Design a protein around this nucleic acid. Structure first.
Lengths: 252, 51, 117, 88, 55, 100
RNA sequence: UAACCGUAGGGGAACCUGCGGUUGGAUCA
RNA sequence: CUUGAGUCUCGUAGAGGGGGGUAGAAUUCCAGGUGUAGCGGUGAAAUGCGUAGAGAUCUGGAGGAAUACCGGUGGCGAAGGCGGCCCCCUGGACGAAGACUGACGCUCAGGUGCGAAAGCGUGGGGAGCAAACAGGAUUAGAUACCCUGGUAGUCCACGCCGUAAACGAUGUCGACUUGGAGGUUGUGCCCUUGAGGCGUGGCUUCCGGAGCUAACGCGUUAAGUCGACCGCCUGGGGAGUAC
């Protein structure tokens, strides 16, 4: 719905993405081709996922983009990216102006394909980008920071005012780059457990982890790991959360 | 509120008690309360009662 | 087959629906009616002339005894505080005393905030 | 406040004459009583602030009177502060 | 008026609901209205007068 | 001392104790340097509501003058006495006599 | 979805929700 | 010296404060009786609850919160705020005959203390309501409004936080300056023969004159005419932000 319309902003995003011939790029929500056109001009082929049948039909008749485009008229939420990576024969460079509504579930959907994604460049609500990148001991640090950082290097790109879109959104936007780790810095036996620990910790972020994770870790276990039970969810590092996930897997 | 009459008939007498409580102090409750909304609108509707 | 002879009749007059039960003297269920069960449902009920056909349905389930007289207990506001008593006066029943048993507290519990569109 | 059998009592102990309910020596002393007596009251309840406001009133009001005596007859001051065990 | 035993001169300032009659339809010098109501309250505890009516 | 006015209603099926109850209280008041300038037995009578069950109770007045101290002793013997259903005692408001 | 202030929590983003106060609220509420 | 200020006496009204009791209505829940296929909810709906018997109805019990009517253009408080009835401890305001002290007063940077709600700590409590959160619906979407639930919290004690459109958006104290209608409370007086009538104080509404004001409007409770002391402002953004 909120179509990117500012030319300078557009140029800045294209410059950041830096599409190169030979890369397999996939846009989620090409819309009115604000990014599709300039990105596609640098490529021989380009894949898009577009739910609006009206706008998809306009891409197909673009004289230069058309011949280059593979258009999937489906929902990205349940799109099999892992299978698309197999077809393109290489990890995917994903990009797009994402609707605020689906942005967080889509990111987790993409994260689950690990290896299959080279990188992601998404427009999101600015506060979402701040959480994604946040480190411990700050307000923005939460479960999303930890899960996102387990999977990826999180790289803020641009902040974008409402006036850059037509119609304008109600809140500031930002572009973030997400790069799945080539080498996972803190591997976890089973991610569902990491997901569970962070949910429990952050659902009670104004309590010490002694209290919020007391159903899962004794004070002795926490002390043994070098984790201070007087600390709260937001004081615990990504590394420590992963150490807790592995413990709970190697011991329960 | 207590009705009772001899000589079977459905006259009424009922709307007589309908002037002290009834659907009024009822709908008064119904939804939420008031707090500041009343002490104000109760002291503004009073202005109305002047002319 | 008990022949209660006379028994009060509660009229649970509400907004989204209304229901009247012709209980006995002590307060035992002898026959209850219901707008929701009176053909039309959804919300078409409520209306007075819609509840009357409901409570009147009792004279078909509680008629197995022989109620020669009965009082009326109207509780809560809504389109069914008058209609009910009327239909009952025509059904053939008698009357002994009309009264409103609507729960009118003294600022006890704090009602729901709700509605705000 | 204070009981008549007490108020009308003390007045006849500091008054340089009779029924001189005005005399500072009197009024002033009359204040200490209601003050000391209330200290036992404020010991309990505590949270009762609206009553202490009046307490503080008579306290400062009492002081406003002591300063006066010192500025009207040095003697009378030190001559009364003792009979009331004031200054503490 | 300042009492409750005078239950005789109270049933007039009420109704079938035992509710304290307003001062609007009384104009009881106000100052008296205050006293008149105070009685009906305390007097209800001695069961001298009723609170509601349905029970 | 300070005046008073206590009206206690004893259980309906314990009226016979009412007369005895009076002597105790009254005697105490007198033995407390107090005074008793009002008294009356209303006996049994219907109630507005079935206060503490039943629908009738025994009524009695007082309107003493004894010192608050000794009367505060009454609230206890009053509470710990299943006979009396309800207790209600107001303040002085100057000596009250006769009428009622 | 009257708005705003305080305070709290939550959310791509304006902002949503709760509690209290305000009129700097329209229509006879 | 006595008119300012204060003391004494005797009255008056008050949801002023702190403590402890206690009552009745309603909600929810637990149990049991009657009775039977719907209930609940919405603009509709759906989630939800129902044949393991709900809802309705009636009997008994448990518990917590708040006190209809009176209630008002009302009252009390420095402000914030304060509503059932009873007792205990306690503050201030006002009137009147008076009696007394004799300028002991006004203001007040710094200082001390009091402070809605939300929030915080320890320990209690927890009916209703309800941030979070979870379902259902609406919608292009709906991290909302609506619906079904619901945790902190709201309640108590004790300690902390000190903010609010903490507003009359109008500092405190005093003296002057046409009027009209009303409210509330004290007192004097009048065939007090009365509901009542005439004054004389306190507090308070609405209209409004002179004047003041940029206008709106304020107008003896002034934003009018003056005097004493204090706080504050000096273009908007950046910013009540950074350090």
């Amino acid at each position: 719905q909120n179509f990117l319309n500012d030319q300078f902003v557009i140029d800045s995003i294209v410059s950041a993405i830096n599409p190169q011939k030979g890369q397999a790029m996939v846009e989620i929500g090409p819309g009115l081709a604000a990014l599709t056109e300039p990105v596609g001009e640098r490529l021989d082929q380009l894949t898009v996922i577009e739910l609006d049948r009206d706008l998809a039909a306009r891409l197909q008749t673009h004289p230069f983009l058309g011949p280059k485009l593979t258009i999937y008229q489906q929902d990205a939420m349940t799109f099999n990216f892992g299978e698309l990576a197999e077809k393109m024969g290489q990890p995917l460079r994903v990009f797009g102006n994402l609707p605020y509504n689906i942005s967080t579930p889509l990111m987790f959907h993409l994260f689950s394909y690990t290896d299959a994604i080279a990188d992601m460049h998404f427009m999101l609500q600015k506060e979402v980008v701040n959480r994604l990148v946040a480190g411990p001991n700050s307000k923005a640090y939460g479960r999303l920071s930890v899960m996102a950082q387990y999977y990826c290097n999180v790289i803020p790109v641009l902040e974008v005012p409402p006036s850059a879109f037509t119609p304008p959104p109600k809140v500031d936007s930002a572009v973030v780059r997400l790069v799945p780790h080539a080498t996972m810095p803190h591997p976890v036996k089973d991610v569902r457990v990491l997901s569970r620990i962070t949910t429990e910790a952050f659902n009670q972020r104004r309590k010490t982890i002694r209290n919020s994770l007391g159903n899962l870790f004794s004070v002795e276990v926490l002390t043994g790991m070098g984790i201070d039970p007087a600390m709260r969810a937001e004081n615990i590092s990504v590394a420590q959360y992963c150490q807790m996930a592995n413990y709970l897997a190697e011991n329960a | 509120i207590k009705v009772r009459e001899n000589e079977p008939f459905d006259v009424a007498l009922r709307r007589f008690k309908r002037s002290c409580e009834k659907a009024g102090v009822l709908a008064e409750v119904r939804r939420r309360e008031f707090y500041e909304k009343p002490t104000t609108e109760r002291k503004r509707a009073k202005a109305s009662a002047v002319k | 087959r008990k022949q209660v002879s006379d028994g009060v009749a509660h009229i649970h007059a509400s907004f989204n629906n209304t229901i009247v039960t012709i209980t006995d003297r002590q307060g035992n269920a002898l026959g209850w009616a219901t707008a929701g069960g009176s053909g039309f449902r959804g919300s078409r009920k409520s209306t007075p002339f819609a509840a009357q056909v409901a409570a009147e349905r009792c004279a078909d389930a509680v008629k197995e005894y022989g109620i020669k007289n009965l009082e009326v207990m109207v509780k809560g506001p809504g389109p069914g505080r008058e209609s009910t008593i009327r239909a009952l006066n025509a059904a053939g029943f008698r009357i002994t005393n009309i009264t409103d048993v609507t729960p009118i507290p003294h600022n006890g519990c704090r009602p729901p905030k709700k509605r705000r569109v | 406040s204070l009981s008549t059998e007490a108020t009308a009592k003390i007045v006849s102990e500091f008054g340089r004459d009779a029924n001189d309910t005005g005399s500072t020596e009197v009024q002033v002393a009359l204040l200490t009583a209601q003050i000391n007596h209330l200290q036992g009251h404020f010991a309990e309840h505590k949270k009762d602030h609206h009553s202490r406001r009046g307490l503080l009133r008579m306290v400062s009001q009492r002081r406003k009177l002591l300063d006066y005596l010192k500025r009207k007859d040095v003697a009378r001051y030190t001559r009364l502060i003792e009979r009331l065990g004031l200054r503490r | 008026e300042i009492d409750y035993k005078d239950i005789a001169t109270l049933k007039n300032y009420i109704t079938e609901s035992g509710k304290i009659v307003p001062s609007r339809i009384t104009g009881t010098r106000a100052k008296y209205q205050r006293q008149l109501a105070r009685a009906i309250k305390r007097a209800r505890y001695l069961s001298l007068l009723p609170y509601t009516d349905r029970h | 001392m300070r005046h008073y006015e206590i009206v206690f209603m004893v259980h309906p099926d314990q009226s016979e104790q009412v007369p005895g109850m009076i002597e105790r209280y009254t005697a105490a008041i007198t033995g407390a340097e107090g005074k008793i300038h009002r008294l009356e037995d209303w006996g049994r009578r219907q109630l507005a509501y079935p206060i503490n069950k039943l629908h009738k109770a025994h009524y009695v007045l007082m309107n003493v003058e004894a010192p608050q101290e000794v009367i505060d002793e009454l609230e206890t013997t009053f509470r710990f006495n299943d006979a009396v259903i309800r207790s209600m005692v107001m303040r002085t408001k100057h000596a009250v006599t006769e009428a009622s």
